[PDB]
Write a protein that binds this ligand. Structure first.
Ligand SMILES: O=C(NC1CN(Cc2cnn(Cc3ccc(Cl)cc3)c2)C1)c1cn(C2CC2)nn1
Ligand SMILES: O=C(NC1CN(Cc2cnn(Cc3ccc(Cl)cc3)c2)C1)c1cn(C2CC2)nn1
Ligand SMILES: C[S@@+](CC[C@H](N)C(=O)[O-])C[C@H]1O[C@@H](n2cnc3c(N)ncnc32)[C@H](O)[C@@H]1O
Ligand SMILES: [Zn+2]
Ligand SMILES: [Zn+2]
Ligand SMILES: [Zn+2]
Length: 438
């Protein structure tokens, strides 16, 4: 049977497009799907490898490897072999000669980069692609009438950078069209991360962007090279709408919704946002002899929201040693009122694990991830990729310090989850099983 189901997935069989009352257009099933089933795949309509990963990944197929070959002309684009080089040429052409001309003045933002490739795919290929079997880039929603003279000013920067760096092999539409398009990208664009959650690049998957949002989703989006796959994490029955999450589901219901309104212009009405069952445990209060009063909680919460924004902006400025102090002390304050499973505590613990890893303090980074994992399993849903990568980190750290048994446990915990989300076939599942076997 295995042959037929790959074909069905590739063609989006057993699914359809419809109008979701109160959510524009959307996607629903016309057959049952069990937990771990592949629904559909969607090859990338446009993509770009992030600048800081050149030399580690091939630009065309995203394979991670050593001994890639360098572009003879510009020396700033790498490939598996000559086949991958030829296939990337229609796109790489947009930057090759310019990178040589501008030297080190060449710094277009990743948003500009990806939009240039969209424009170039439209001259070459005006008609409907295999990425667009149910929704087309042309049809993408913009939220143009909801924007303001902060946002609209930000786009006009990108429009200028596009004209400045790309005029040579693109001809541009009128300003009105470019503003709409840059808004469409924001509403429909995807990021790609690796198994440790480092940024790799950006891309457009049109069929994938038909699906609407829920904080208790029933599918999950994973990557295989530049290809997107979609697998179920709850049982789905005929006539039922198919939902992803668009955001990190760790945080409480207020925090989630500020983000959704800001980036996507809507308010979620799902069961977790209605009942708010998990909010109380995400903001778990210390149980002291004289237990903390109500105003003393509103204090530590607003302090915590701000020490996250301070740290966000401090990543571009400061020393590693100074950032690790900012985490230590911010935890040290919060621990009087908040328990160790409070998500605002867990936030700073994660950032501190990041700082310890760049410093190669592997024992120091290990007891952060030890305190993280059990709370992460409680707050997140079943089959969460966030939970899976943290196990993965623990597995690797344990084995770096020669403690085989606890490392093998943590690696199998990660594989258990990945089987459901990435499928049993996945290249990652092999790569981890070779860490086991040595
Ligand atoms: O950009 C979006 N999502 C990106 C967040 N990325 C999460 C992700 C996936 N795989 N991995 C890598 C990964 C691989 C192996 C493990 Cl064990 C762990 C991790 C990260 C996907 C997005 C865009 N929208 C548009 C529709 C509004 N919604 N979400
Ligand atoms: O929900 C969170 N992140 C989600 C937003 N991320 C995906 C994303 C990004 N951009 N775009 C739109 C976009 C993508 C590519 C280009 Cl070229 C253009 C546009 C999607 C994932 C989140 C992050 N945190 C941090 C505090 C820990 N908390 N929640
Ligand atoms: C990537 S799109 C999804 C496709 C969209 N329905 C369309 O066809 O234009 C994101 C947009 O869909 C809408 N949307 C997604 N999930 C929603 C929800 N749970 N409630 C209301 N609107 C939602 C929002 O308007 C959001 O900006
Ligand atoms: Zn390649
Ligand atoms: Zn080149
Ligand atoms: Zn919700």
């Amino acid at each position: 049977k295995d042959d037929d189901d790959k074909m069905r997935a590739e063609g989006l069989g057993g699914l359809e497009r419809f109008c979701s009352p109160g959510k524009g257009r959307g996607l629903r099933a016309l057959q049952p799907f069990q937990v771990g089933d592949l629904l559909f795949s969607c090859p990338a309509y446009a993509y770009v490898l992030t600048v800081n990963e050149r030399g580690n990944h091939c630009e065309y197929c995203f394979t991670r490897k050593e001994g890639l070959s360098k572009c003879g002309r510009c020396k700033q684009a790498f490939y598996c072999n000559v086949e991958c080089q030829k296939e990337d040429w229609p796109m790489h052409k947009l930057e090759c000669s310019p990178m040589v001309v501008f030297g080190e003045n060449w710094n277009p933002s990743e948003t500009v980069r990806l939009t240039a490739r969209i424009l170039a795919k439209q001259k070459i290929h005006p008609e409907r692609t295999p990425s667009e079997k149910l929704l087309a880039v042309k049809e993408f929603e913009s939220h143009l009438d909801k924007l303001d003279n902060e946002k609209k000013d930000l786009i006009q920067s990108d429009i200028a950078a596009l004209h400045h760096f790309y005029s040579k092999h693109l001809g541009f539409p009128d300003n009105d069209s470019l503003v709409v398009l840059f808004a469409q990208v924001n509403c429909n664009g995807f990021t790609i991360e690796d198994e440790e959650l480092s940024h790799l690049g950006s891309a457009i998957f049109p069929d994938v962007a038909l699906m609407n949002h829920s904080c208790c989703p029933n599918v999950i989006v994973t990557y295989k090279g530049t290809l997107a796959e979609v697998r179920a994490v709850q049982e789905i029955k005929p006539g039922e709408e198919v939902f992803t999450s668009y955001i990190d589901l760790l945080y409480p219901t207020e925090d989630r919704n500020d983000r959704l309104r800001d980036s996507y212009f809507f308010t979620c009405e799902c069961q977790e946002c209605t009942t708010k069952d998990k909010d109380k445990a995400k903001v778990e209060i210390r149980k002291l002899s004289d237990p903390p009063k109500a105003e003393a909680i509103r204090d530590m919460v607003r302090y915590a929201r701000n020490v996250i924004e301070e740290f966000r902006r401090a990543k571009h400025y400061k020393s590693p040693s100074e950032l690790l102090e900012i985490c230590e002390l911010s935890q040290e304050k919060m621990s009087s009122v908040f328990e160790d499973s409070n998500v605002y505590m867990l936030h700073m613990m994660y950032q501190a694990m990041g700082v310890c890893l760049y410093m190669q303090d592997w024992e120091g980074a290990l007891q952060y991830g030890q305190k993280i994992i059990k709370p992460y399993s409680k707050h997140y849903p079943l089959y969460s990729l966030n939970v899976a990568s943290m196990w993965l980190k623990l597995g690797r750290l344990y084995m770096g310090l020669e403690h085989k048994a606890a490392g093998e446990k943590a690696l199998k915990k990660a594989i258990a989850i990945m089987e459901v989300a990435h499928g049993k076939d996945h290249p990652y599942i092999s790569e981890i099983k070779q860490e086991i076997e040595s």
